[PDB]
Design a protein around this nucleic acid. Structure first.
Ligand code: ADP
Ligand code: ZN
Length: 650
RNA sequence: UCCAUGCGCAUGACG
RNA sequence: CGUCAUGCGCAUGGA
């Protein structure tokens, strides 16, 4: 079987000639299948050539790899050729180079391939080359812009290509390089206020891929257009506690002589709070880092309240101050500052809570909007929002709300898996379960945070409602936008025209432009190398000291620290040990004699290790140069010794 | 299956 | 350059 649709046929035609073209098509056109056909044709040709045919397919997300190995490639070609569903998570007893030698076809993930190539350049002796393959295929090429995995990969291919040109002229023989296909929904357009900038961006993409031309369907376009149902665009749009909190912020400002130089509930105030916090850290002073941090917490509460039930802000600060109280209690087992701030809060805490019960509330507007939508439904919907906490708050509020229960439409939250912002990350398994549930109708509506926007298989949904999120199927579209669609349309128009412009270009001029872009990218990479190496020069054993940032006291030295796994830094020598405190709630966490959090107590190879984080400490060189904050160890060019387990045997 | 950690990347907003 | 929010990948250790 594997019959190929017509509009797919023409667009794929050039690649069958060895063309390293790009194929951009819309969503739902099943470019996976045309990709399969192309792979099949390339391999059959290499069979006729009596030469080995290798394909190494790449994706930026794992689940895509699983889907292609599950539903697309193996079904059609499993019996014809060897296929492997490679991924970083899937424990594979065998190393990558072997499967490079042992499988005719490969689904994979970019970073894995890059790591193998790095080992080739390194002394690990695990070797692979883009030349070793006969064909490289990529999905969502549009990510090949800025130091992305795809881009980092192709840059090597280019460099080699230019050497190949020089050798072609200088020498009759030249080394080989593979064909390159690239598939995307749309090449995309970045920060292009002009069709010229857009044209340049597109050309930069093509250069990164080194592709011959872009390809899109116009002749057979009507067939695909009718075949694919495409939704219509649309946009639809719908205190006292805040005042008290602002008053308290002003009270702290008066108590700290802190000038916001900015409005309330704005990013710039937070940015100033952080910069002031850094200055206080370098000054080793309190009510400066401390109160600045407290103010930042307050402004976070504000921005929460600006869109959210102030109950949630009360919960936010309930959590914050209760945990601070617990830290102080552990320390005890308080000064003018902490007492002032804590009491300044607790005094109004009950009143704030009472105010929180009073609705007098964007969320209340969205509730009415949503219920009105549900009356139309007769059943699938997707919410979106900026943050993770937002999704949980929405799900909690909707579940609590009786009206939505009366409607009988269930709802659940959904987020990514990155352990960031100290918020619970959903696991890939859990995400898969939830989307399966919604597809089955177990959950009528799914709250999301851009995870559902792409990758995850969500289709045939009546409505796609949004809640201040910058950005349906089954021939049913109920787009909503509560609180940039026009500007987005303008950009789409611009990129389409730029694409047509590039398609209608001289092959010579086009080749010259893309060649220049290739050279530029290579030069940028070389410059990046130059600066990156210069960063790591000092490599001092011990030229710094770790200090608590609330109480600017020496906490460690430069030499007492040791490294385990060449990842984690730790301080044995219990002179430090008697200082730090331990606390847990629900391996364990570490805190300060001042309540300042310090890190966690990891255990490696059986040694108990009070591991820590540079973020929560402030540097103090031996040269007495000003204090510093790095947010990560690698920023420091000096080198710490790997721990010797023979030492500290005890 | 879960936990914790390190590293890199892109996106949007903001300065 | 920094900030914040969001999403992704890789590599670890333990259970
Ligand atoms: N040659 C073909 N004939 C008929 N339908 C096809 C053909 N090739 C692809 N399709 C359709 O394309 C769909 C696959 O789309 P999919 O790959 O999931 O979307 P996308 O291309 O956006 O990833 C299949 O459901 C299939 O019906
Ligand atoms: Zn302290």
């Amino acid at each position: 079987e594997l019959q190929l649709r017509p509009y797919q046929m023409e667009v794929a035609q050039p690649a069958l000639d060895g063309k390293n073209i790009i194929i951009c098509l819309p969503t739902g056109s099943g470019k996976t299948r045309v990709a399969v056909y192309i792979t099949k044709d390339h391999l059959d040709k290499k069979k006729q050539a009596s030469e080995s045919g290798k394909v190494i397919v790449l994706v930026n997300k794992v689940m895509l790899a699983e889907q292609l190995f599950r539903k697309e490639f193996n079904p059609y070609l499993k019996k014809w050729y060897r296929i492997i569903g490679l991924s970083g998570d899937t424990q594979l007893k065998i190393s990558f180079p072997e499967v490079v030698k042992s499988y005719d076809v490969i689904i994979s993930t970019a970073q894995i391939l890059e790591n193998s190539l790095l080992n080739l350049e390194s002394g690990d002796d695990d070797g692979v080359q883009l030349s070793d393959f006969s064909l490289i295929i990529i999905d969502e090429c549009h990510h090949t812009n800025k130091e992305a995995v795809y881009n980092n990969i192709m840059r090597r291919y280019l460099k080699q290509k230019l050497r190949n040109n020089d050798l072609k002229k200088q020498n009759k023989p030249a080394i080989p390089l593979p064909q390159i296909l690239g598939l995307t929904a749309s090449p995309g357009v970045g920060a292009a206020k002009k069709q010229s900038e857009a044209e340049k961006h597109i050309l930069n993409i093509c250069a990164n891929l080194d592709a011959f031309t872009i390809k899109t369907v116009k002749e057979n376009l009507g067939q695909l257009k009718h075949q694919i149902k495409e939704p219509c665009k649309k946009f639809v749009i719908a205190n006292p506690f805040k005042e008290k909190l602002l008053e308290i912020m002003a009270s702290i400002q008066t108590y700290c002589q802190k000038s916001p130089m900015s409005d309330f509930g704005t990013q710039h105030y937070e940015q100033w709070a952080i910069q002031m916090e850094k200055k206080a850290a370098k000054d080793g002073n309190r009510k400066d880092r401390v109160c600045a941090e407290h103010l930042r917490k307050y402004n976070e509460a504000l921005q929460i309240n600006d869109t959210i039930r102030m109950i949630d802000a009360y919960s936010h600060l309930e959590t914050f101050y209760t945990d601070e109280k617990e830290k102080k209690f552990a320390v005890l087992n308080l000064d003018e500052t902490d007492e002032f701030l804590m009491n300044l809060f607790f005094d109004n805490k009950k009143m704030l809570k009472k105010l929180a019960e009073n609705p007098k509330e964007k969320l209340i507007k969205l509730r009415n909007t949503i219920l009105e939508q549900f009356t139309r439904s007769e059943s699938r919907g997707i919410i979106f929002t900026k943050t993770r906490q937002s999704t949980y708050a929405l799900s909690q509020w909707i579940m609590e709300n009786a009206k939505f229960a009366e409607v009988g439409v269930k709802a659940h939250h959904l987020i990514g898996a990155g352990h960031s912002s100290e918020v619970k990350p959903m696991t890939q398994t859990e995400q898969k379960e939830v989307i399966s549930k919604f597809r089955t109708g177990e959950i009528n509506l799914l709250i999301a945070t851009t995870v559902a926007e792409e990758g995850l298989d969500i289709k045939e949904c009546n409505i796609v409602i949004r809640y201040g999120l910058v950005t349906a199927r089954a021939d049913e579209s109920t787009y909503v936008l509560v609180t940039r669609e026009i500007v987005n349309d303008f950009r789409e128009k611009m990129m389409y025209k730029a694409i047509n412009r590039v398609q209608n270009m001289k092959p010579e001029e086009y080749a010259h432009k893309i060649l220049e872009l290739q050279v530029q990218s290579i030069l940028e990479k070389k410059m990046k190398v130059k600066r990156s190496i210069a960063k790591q020069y000092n490599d001092n054993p011990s030229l710094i000291t770790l200090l608590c940032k609330n109480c600017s006291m020496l906490v460690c030295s430069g030499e007492n620290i040791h490294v385990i796994e060449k990842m984690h830094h730790v301080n044995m020598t219990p002179e430090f040990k008697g200082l730090y405190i331990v606390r847990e709630n629900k391996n364990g966490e570490i805190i300060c004699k001042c309540g300042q959090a310090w890190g966690t107590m990891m255990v490696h190879k059986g040694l108990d290790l009070p591991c820590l984080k540079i973020r929560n400490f402030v540097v103090n060189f031996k040269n007495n140069s000003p204090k510093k904050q790095y947010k990560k160890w690698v920023e420091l060019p000096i080198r710490f010794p790997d721990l010797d387990y023979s030492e500290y045997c005890l």
